Amino acid sequence: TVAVVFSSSGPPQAQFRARLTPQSFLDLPLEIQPLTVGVNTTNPSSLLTQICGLLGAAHVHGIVFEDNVDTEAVAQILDFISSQTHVPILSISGGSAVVLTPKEPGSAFLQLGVSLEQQLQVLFKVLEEYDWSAFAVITSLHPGHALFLEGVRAVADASHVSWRLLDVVTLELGPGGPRARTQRLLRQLDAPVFVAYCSREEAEVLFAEAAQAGLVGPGHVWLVPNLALGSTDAPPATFPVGLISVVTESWRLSLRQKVRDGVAILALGAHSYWRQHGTLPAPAGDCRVHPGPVSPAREAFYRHLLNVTWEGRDFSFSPGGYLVQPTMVVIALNRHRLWEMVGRWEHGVLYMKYPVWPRYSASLQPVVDSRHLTVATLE
Amino acid sequence: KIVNIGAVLSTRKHEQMFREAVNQANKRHGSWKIQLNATSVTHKPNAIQMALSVCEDLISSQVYAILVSHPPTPNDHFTPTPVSYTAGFYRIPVLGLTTRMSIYSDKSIHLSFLRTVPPYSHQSSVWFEMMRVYSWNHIILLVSDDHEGRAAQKRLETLLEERESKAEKVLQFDPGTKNVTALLMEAKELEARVIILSASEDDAATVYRAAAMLNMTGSGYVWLVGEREISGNALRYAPDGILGLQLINGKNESAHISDAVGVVAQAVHELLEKENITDPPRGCVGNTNIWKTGPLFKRVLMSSKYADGVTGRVEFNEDGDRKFANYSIMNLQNRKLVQVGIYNGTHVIPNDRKIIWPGGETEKPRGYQMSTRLK
Ligand SMILES: *[C@@H]1O[C@H](CO)[C@@H](O[C@@H]2O[C@H](CO)[C@@H](O[C@@H]3O[C@H](CO)[C@@H](O)[C@H](O)[C@@H]3O)[C@H](O)[C@H]2NC(C)=O)[C@H](O)[C@H]1NC(C)=O
Ligand SMILES: *[C@@H]1O[C@H](CO)[C@@H](O[C@@H]2O[C@H](CO)[C@@H](O)[C@H](O)[C@H]2NC(C)=O)[C@H](O)[C@H]1NC(C)=O
Ligand SMILES: *[C@@H]1O[C@H](CO)[C@@H](O)[C@H](O)[C@H]1NC(C)=O
Ligand SMILES: *[C@@H]1O[C@H](CO)[C@@H](O)[C@H](O)[C@H]1NC(C)=O
Ligand SMILES: *[C@@H]1O[C@H](CO)[C@@H](O)[C@H](O)[C@H]1NC(C)=O
Ligand SMILES: *[C@@H]1O[C@H](CO)[C@@H](O)[C@H](O)[C@H]1NC(C)=O
Ligand SMILES: *[C@@H]1O[C@H](CO)[C@@H](O)[C@H](O)[C@H]1NC(C)=O
């Protein structure tokens, strides 16, 4: 059996009621008949209360999560629960998408996203297909930057370019801080392209200190990883036109589609167990009552659940529980303040859509540098 | 105003010690400005029950800070976790006074957590300092495979490369694993004669035995260990002379409480003489928003120097851990630990004893027998 958790919404209950009956929704070969739960006001109080009490009313075999973005602490809790009750779990949403690096030694979180390294490994391709080859790095003092900072210096070494990096900055950008000191470190800068790493609440504080120091015009271009961007769709003010950020493939989709893509994994994993090991591995998970001394059998089901292809995609996970080699895309902020897919990254070779980055201006009316021309040949 | 702080402890007598200590802290610098209070709970077996009990603790008080201890240790690891997840959700700065695992230092996972005792990773500073003093320059390292082990590797490496020495042949071995003689034999043809162990009390027992067959415990070889490496079911099997080490006064569980409330109170005053300090949220249920000034309270609490520390001078580093602690070296003679020195903050100072090296010799046996035969 499978469970589903709604942990955030503007009232979708028409989509909730939609998922109530379809015990025959899928074509996957198993008893996919799903139960359901709901959550108002996600917090460690209710979130603990619900989701093992439910583990008493059934033996389901596993859970599937979803919530809203901008809440980060809810990432660990789910890992904590799965450490006791010994029940696999799978997160497909915004909130718990950001990847936790060290997971508890015996848990089965199975997150659905990409690391930091596997995003820098895509920026540092775009960055050289236009061979800007000279940049500066800006990071706040947000938890986990020392990890990121080791990303660039390592990747910049396992490549074949000079990668002349000018400098690095570090500056407190919360609600309270001396803007002048940051104004000092900012105004004292000169570089073509900037690679910034900050939270969203941090972002609007940064990109607002941008304009007054003159760092937003067509004479520059910015790159920020998956984290800094908004929900996905409504970008705030002060985000300059021409932003670039890499995003996993399910970037634009319907929440009802993801869940069908979610349950598919547990399904394709389960049915694949009967074929090889046989007969539906023991589905069971117990709450507070005498939980989890050791797992000799469920831990053998874990491995089956790793590799799983479906509808022409690859979802193979790594022991760290983050996708290995997903087909990522790139996105940018055009002159309508939307996001438009700029270039896919499929199977190791970065495609594109613009043979030159159209560089905007203060009031649209895209500027082309005069000295650049197009040559047409043949063989 | 009534400022409320809570704590989680073990015996209910230490709870009374904590109440008496917060009282003596009131009568110390208190005034008519703001008074303090206390609230206590006790552990339970199922950690989930403990998380729910911590929401009960929290709804029962607009808590400003927490304290945690683990005197009974069926799981030295999973005892102080659930309070950290349950409180970090609201940035409620939790202090931990007795726990040494190294995972609680990675701040990306536990958003807010502090200590009053340095962890097992900071141990290798005294190893490197002893290496500098006694002039040993060719060392074999020996570490387990779990995070608590892997930390020491990076620590020693970054501490050595600052002088470009590049110690040799770091050997790994999986945990809980018996029959490690398949590994030691690879460290039998090596030039370096001084090993450095770092493992768990169940593993160290094994390799002490597994050495007894290979006969490397004999004369000429010298090696040193860490705190958990002795004082367990393993110390029965140790070979004499292993220069291990220990803490000054850790495991006391009572001296610390007198230290924490001293460094907590000296902060709450240094804070409230300032702008909006509104309140922490009263109630696990019914709220989804973080205390809007949590980070400030941790921001200030980081640098709060404290003078009259029953343990000593207490201060914090950039990650959050008591810097500048005391370690007291040991040495195993005739199946009884006898101190041979004291490690004070930055340097080592021995006195009034003659060290007994394993083989029974009485002169400092340098490593590195340059092997004449050649491959
Ligand atoms: C100052 O500290 C005291 C000590 O904790 C705080 O008071 C105590 O108040 C709570 C809140 O009602 C009492 O608790 C409840 O206790 C009952 C007892 O059975 C329990 O069944 C409930 O589940 C609930 O937890 C608690 O009993 C009481 N202490 C004692 C010893 O009776 C007080 O609120 C604090 N005030 C300020 C201004 O800091
Ligand atoms: C994908 O996962 C399956 C299942 O974990 C792997 O097949 C297993 O291989 C081991 C070792 O030979 C066997 O003990 C298991 O019984 C196998 N399970 C199944 C489902 O047959 C498989 O090797 C992995 N790799 C690929 C490419 O499929
Ligand atoms: C396991 O221990 C035995 C002791 O009887 C030893 O002979 C053998 O070499 C060990 N295994 C390996 C792989 O070394
Ligand atoms: C110890 O060394 C080897 C085992 O590594 C063994 O062959 C030898 O006989 C032993 N010698 C003594 C004196 O115990
Ligand atoms: C703990 O420390 C205190 C103060 O340093 C000391 O008085 C006491 O003897 C120590 N040991 C115990 C068991 O309390
Ligand atoms: C702890 O370190 C201090 C600092 O030098 C020292 O004075 C003291 O003797 C050491 N030992 C204690 C406090 O037991
Ligand atoms: C440690 O002891 C030495 C002994 O000379 C002294 O010079 C040094 O200042 C002391 N440092 C600490 C940690 O107090």
PDB file of N, CA and C in Angstrom, chain A residues 204-252:
ATOM      1  N   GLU A 204      16.724  39.731  -2.211  1.00  0.00           N
ATOM      2  CA  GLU A 204      16.180  41.073  -2.384  1.00  0.00           C
ATOM      3  C   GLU A 204      16.994  42.113  -1.627  1.00  0.00           C
ATOM      4  N   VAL A 205      17.660  41.707  -0.549  1.00  0.00           N
ATOM      5  CA  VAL A 205      18.542  42.639   0.141  1.00  0.00           C
ATOM      6  C   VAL A 205      19.793  42.886  -0.684  1.00  0.00           C
ATOM      7  N   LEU A 206      20.248  41.871  -1.421  1.00  0.00           N
ATOM      8  CA  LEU A 206      21.453  42.037  -2.227  1.00  0.00           C
ATOM      9  C   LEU A 206      21.163  42.814  -3.497  1.00  0.00           C
ATOM     10  N   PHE A 207      20.267  42.298  -4.333  1.00  0.00           N
ATOM     11  CA  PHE A 207      20.042  42.909  -5.637  1.00  0.00           C
ATOM     12  C   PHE A 207      19.505  44.328  -5.518  1.00  0.00           C
ATOM     13  N   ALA A 208      19.046  44.728  -4.336  1.00  0.00           N
ATOM     14  CA  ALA A 208      18.702  46.128  -4.126  1.00  0.00           C
ATOM     15  C   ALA A 208      19.937  46.965  -3.843  1.00  0.00           C
ATOM     16  N   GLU A 209      20.941  46.379  -3.201  1.00  0.00           N
ATOM     17  CA  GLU A 209      22.211  47.076  -3.042  1.00  0.00           C
ATOM     18  C   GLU A 209      23.012  47.040  -4.333  1.00  0.00           C
ATOM     19  N   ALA A 210      22.477  46.395  -5.362  1.00  0.00           N
ATOM     20  CA  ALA A 210      23.166  46.299  -6.639  1.00  0.00           C
ATOM     21  C   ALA A 210      23.059  47.601  -7.418  1.00  0.00           C
ATOM     22  N   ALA A 211      21.830  48.014  -7.715  1.00  0.00           N
ATOM     23  CA  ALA A 211      21.569  49.166  -8.569  1.00  0.00           C
ATOM     24  C   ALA A 211      22.343  50.402  -8.135  1.00  0.00           C
ATOM     25  N   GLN A 212      22.328  50.704  -6.836  1.00  0.00           N
ATOM     26  CA  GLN A 212      22.921  51.956  -6.379  1.00  0.00           C
ATOM     27  C   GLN A 212      24.439  51.946  -6.510  1.00  0.00           C
ATOM     28  N   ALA A 213      25.044  50.772  -6.657  1.00  0.00           N
ATOM     29  CA  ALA A 213      26.464  50.678  -6.953  1.00  0.00           C
ATOM     30  C   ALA A 213      26.737  50.448  -8.430  1.00  0.00           C
ATOM     31  N   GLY A 214      25.694  50.366  -9.256  1.00  0.00           N
ATOM     32  CA  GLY A 214      25.866  50.276 -10.692  1.00  0.00           C
ATOM     33  C   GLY A 214      26.239  48.915 -11.222  1.00  0.00           C
ATOM     34  N   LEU A 215      25.733  47.842 -10.627  1.00  0.00           N
ATOM     35  CA  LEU A 215      26.129  46.498 -11.010  1.00  0.00           C
ATOM     36  C   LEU A 215      25.004  45.708 -11.654  1.00  0.00           C
ATOM     37  N   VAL A 216      24.129  46.354 -12.427  1.00  0.00           N
ATOM     38  CA  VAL A 216      22.964  45.655 -12.964  1.00  0.00           C
ATOM     39  C   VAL A 216      22.805  45.827 -14.462  1.00  0.00           C
ATOM     40  N   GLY A 217      23.470  46.811 -15.058  1.00  0.00           N
ATOM     41  CA  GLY A 217      23.275  47.131 -16.452  1.00  0.00           C
ATOM     42  C   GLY A 217      23.691  46.019 -17.392  1.00  0.00           C
ATOM     43  N   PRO A 218      23.450  46.216 -18.688  1.00  0.00           N
ATOM     44  CA  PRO A 218      23.871  45.203 -19.669  1.00  0.00           C
ATOM     45  C   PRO A 218      25.355  44.908 -19.650  1.00  0.00           C
ATOM     46  N   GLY A 219      26.135  45.646 -18.871  1.00  0.00           N
ATOM     47  CA  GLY A 219      27.552  45.373 -18.769  1.00  0.00           C
ATOM     48  C   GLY A 219      27.897  44.254 -17.807  1.00  0.00           C
ATOM     49  N   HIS A 220      26.902  43.491 -17.354  1.00  0.00           N
ATOM     50  CA  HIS A 220      27.146  42.406 -16.415  1.00  0.00           C
ATOM     51  C   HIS A 220      26.085  41.331 -16.573  1.00  0.00           C
ATOM     52  N   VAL A 221      26.354  40.166 -15.989  1.00  0.00           N
ATOM     53  CA  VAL A 221      25.439  39.032 -16.015  1.00  0.00           C
ATOM     54  C   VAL A 221      25.650  38.212 -14.748  1.00  0.00           C
ATOM     55  N   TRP A 222      24.568  37.636 -14.225  1.00  0.00           N
ATOM     56  CA  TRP A 222      24.566  36.988 -12.919  1.00  0.00           C
ATOM     57  C   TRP A 222      24.216  35.515 -13.053  1.00  0.00           C
ATOM     58  N   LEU A 223      24.711  34.704 -12.122  1.00  0.00           N
ATOM     59  CA  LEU A 223      24.367  33.292 -12.026  1.00  0.00           C
ATOM     60  C   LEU A 223      24.129  32.944 -10.565  1.00  0.00           C
ATOM     61  N   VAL A 224      22.982  32.347 -10.267  1.00  0.00           N
ATOM     62  CA  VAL A 224      22.697  31.906  -8.906  1.00  0.00           C
ATOM     63  C   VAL A 224      22.157  30.484  -8.959  1.00  0.00           C
ATOM     64  N   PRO A 225      22.542  29.606  -8.043  1.00  0.00           N
ATOM     65  CA  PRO A 225      22.079  28.219  -8.109  1.00  0.00           C
ATOM     66  C   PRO A 225      20.595  28.112  -7.812  1.00  0.00           C
ATOM     67  N   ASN A 226      20.126  26.867  -7.766  1.00  0.00           N
ATOM     68  CA  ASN A 226      18.701  26.570  -7.656  1.00  0.00           C
ATOM     69  C   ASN A 226      18.033  27.249  -6.472  1.00  0.00           C
ATOM     70  N   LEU A 227      18.795  27.618  -5.448  1.00  0.00           N
ATOM     71  CA  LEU A 227      18.196  27.993  -4.174  1.00  0.00           C
ATOM     72  C   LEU A 227      17.564  29.376  -4.231  1.00  0.00           C
ATOM     73  N   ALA A 228      18.280  30.353  -4.779  1.00  0.00           N
ATOM     74  CA  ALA A 228      17.915  31.749  -4.560  1.00  0.00           C
ATOM     75  C   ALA A 228      16.583  32.106  -5.205  1.00  0.00           C
ATOM     76  N   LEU A 229      16.189  31.388  -6.249  1.00  0.00           N
ATOM     77  CA  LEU A 229      15.018  31.795  -7.016  1.00  0.00           C
ATOM     78  C   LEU A 229      13.746  31.724  -6.179  1.00  0.00           C
ATOM     79  N   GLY A 230      12.676  32.317  -6.709  1.00  0.00           N
ATOM     80  CA  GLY A 230      11.421  32.436  -6.003  1.00  0.00           C
ATOM     81  C   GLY A 230      10.713  31.102  -5.892  1.00  0.00           C
ATOM     82  N   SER A 231       9.383  31.149  -5.855  1.00  0.00           N
ATOM     83  CA  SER A 231       8.605  29.908  -5.782  1.00  0.00           C
ATOM     84  C   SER A 231       8.930  29.120  -7.048  1.00  0.00           C
ATOM     85  N   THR A 232       8.373  29.472  -8.202  1.00  0.00           N
ATOM     86  CA  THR A 232       9.063  29.338  -9.477  1.00  0.00           C
ATOM     87  C   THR A 232       8.586  30.445 -10.402  1.00  0.00           C
ATOM     88  N   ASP A 233       7.363  30.921 -10.154  1.00  0.00           N
ATOM     89  CA  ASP A 233       6.578  31.532 -11.221  1.00  0.00           C
ATOM     90  C   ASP A 233       6.497  33.044 -11.077  1.00  0.00           C
ATOM     91  N   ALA A 234       6.251  33.535  -9.867  1.00  0.00           N
ATOM     92  CA  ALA A 234       6.129  34.967  -9.653  1.00  0.00           C
ATOM     93  C   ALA A 234       7.426  35.509  -9.080  1.00  0.00           C
ATOM     94  N   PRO A 235       8.331  36.026  -9.899  1.00  0.00           N
ATOM     95  CA  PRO A 235       9.583  36.539  -9.378  1.00  0.00           C
ATOM     96  C   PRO A 235       9.395  37.936  -8.823  1.00  0.00           C
ATOM     97  N   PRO A 236      10.006  38.239  -7.687  1.00  0.00           N
ATOM     98  CA  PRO A 236       9.790  39.543  -7.065  1.00  0.00           C
ATOM     99  C   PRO A 236      10.392  40.660  -7.896  1.00  0.00           C
ATOM    100  N   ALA A 237      10.251  41.872  -7.381  1.00  0.00           N
ATOM    101  CA  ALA A 237      10.966  42.994  -7.962  1.00  0.00           C
ATOM    102  C   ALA A 237      12.438  42.865  -7.605  1.00  0.00           C
ATOM    103  N   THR A 238      13.278  43.671  -8.252  1.00  0.00           N
ATOM    104  CA  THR A 238      14.694  43.813  -7.935  1.00  0.00           C
ATOM    105  C   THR A 238      15.523  42.625  -8.430  1.00  0.00           C
ATOM    106  N   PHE A 239      14.880  41.575  -8.930  1.00  0.00           N
ATOM    107  CA  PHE A 239      15.607  40.562  -9.690  1.00  0.00           C
ATOM    108  C   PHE A 239      15.926  41.098 -11.076  1.00  0.00           C
ATOM    109  N   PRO A 240      17.186  41.378 -11.387  1.00  0.00           N
ATOM    110  CA  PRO A 240      17.520  41.965 -12.685  1.00  0.00           C
ATOM    111  C   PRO A 240      17.083  41.084 -13.838  1.00  0.00           C
ATOM    112  N   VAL A 241      16.833  41.724 -14.978  1.00  0.00           N
ATOM    113  CA  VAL A 241      16.580  40.955 -16.179  1.00  0.00           C
ATOM    114  C   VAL A 241      17.877  40.302 -16.644  1.00  0.00           C
ATOM    115  N   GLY A 242      17.752  39.086 -17.154  1.00  0.00           N
ATOM    116  CA  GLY A 242      18.916  38.317 -17.527  1.00  0.00           C
ATOM    117  C   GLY A 242      19.521  37.490 -16.420  1.00  0.00           C
ATOM    118  N   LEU A 243      18.715  36.978 -15.503  1.00  0.00           N
ATOM    119  CA  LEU A 243      19.229  36.059 -14.500  1.00  0.00           C
ATOM    120  C   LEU A 243      19.388  34.681 -15.120  1.00  0.00           C
ATOM    121  N   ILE A 244      20.246  33.859 -14.527  1.00  0.00           N
ATOM    122  CA  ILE A 244      20.474  32.502 -15.004  1.00  0.00           C
ATOM    123  C   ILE A 244      20.538  31.586 -13.799  1.00  0.00           C
ATOM    124  N   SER A 245      19.824  30.465 -13.863  1.00  0.00           N
ATOM    125  CA  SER A 245      19.858  29.489 -12.787  1.00  0.00           C
ATOM    126  C   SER A 245      19.438  28.138 -13.327  1.00  0.00           C
ATOM    127  N   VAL A 246      20.106  27.083 -12.880  1.00  0.00           N
ATOM    128  CA  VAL A 246      19.817  25.740 -13.364  1.00  0.00           C
ATOM    129  C   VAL A 246      18.735  25.117 -12.494  1.00  0.00           C
ATOM    130  N   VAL A 247      17.846  24.350 -13.109  1.00  0.00           N
ATOM    131  CA  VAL A 247      16.695  23.777 -12.430  1.00  0.00           C
ATOM    132  C   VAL A 247      16.471  22.375 -12.966  1.00  0.00           C
ATOM    133  N   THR A 248      16.088  21.450 -12.087  1.00  0.00           N
ATOM    134  CA  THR A 248      15.800  20.084 -12.506  1.00  0.00           C
ATOM    135  C   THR A 248      14.656  20.037 -13.509  1.00  0.00           C
ATOM    136  N   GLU A 249      14.404  18.860 -14.078  1.00  0.00           N
ATOM    137  CA  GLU A 249      13.595  18.783 -15.291  1.00  0.00           C
ATOM    138  C   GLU A 249      12.115  19.011 -15.029  1.00  0.00           C
ATOM    139  N   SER A 250      11.617  18.636 -13.852  1.00  0.00           N
ATOM    140  CA  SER A 250      10.187  18.762 -13.582  1.00  0.00           C
ATOM    141  C   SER A 250       9.822  20.202 -13.264  1.00  0.00           C
ATOM    142  N   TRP A 251      10.690  21.135 -13.648  1.00  0.00           N
ATOM    143  CA  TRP A 251      10.544  22.570 -13.444  1.00  0.00           C
ATOM    144  C   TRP A 251       9.115  23.069 -13.585  1.00  0.00           C
ATOM    145  N   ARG A 252       8.457  22.761 -14.698  1.00  0.00           N
ATOM    146  CA  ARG A 252       7.075  23.172 -14.912  1.00  0.00           C
ATOM    147  C   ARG A 252       6.202  21.935 -15.046  1.00  0.00           C
TER     148      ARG A 252
END
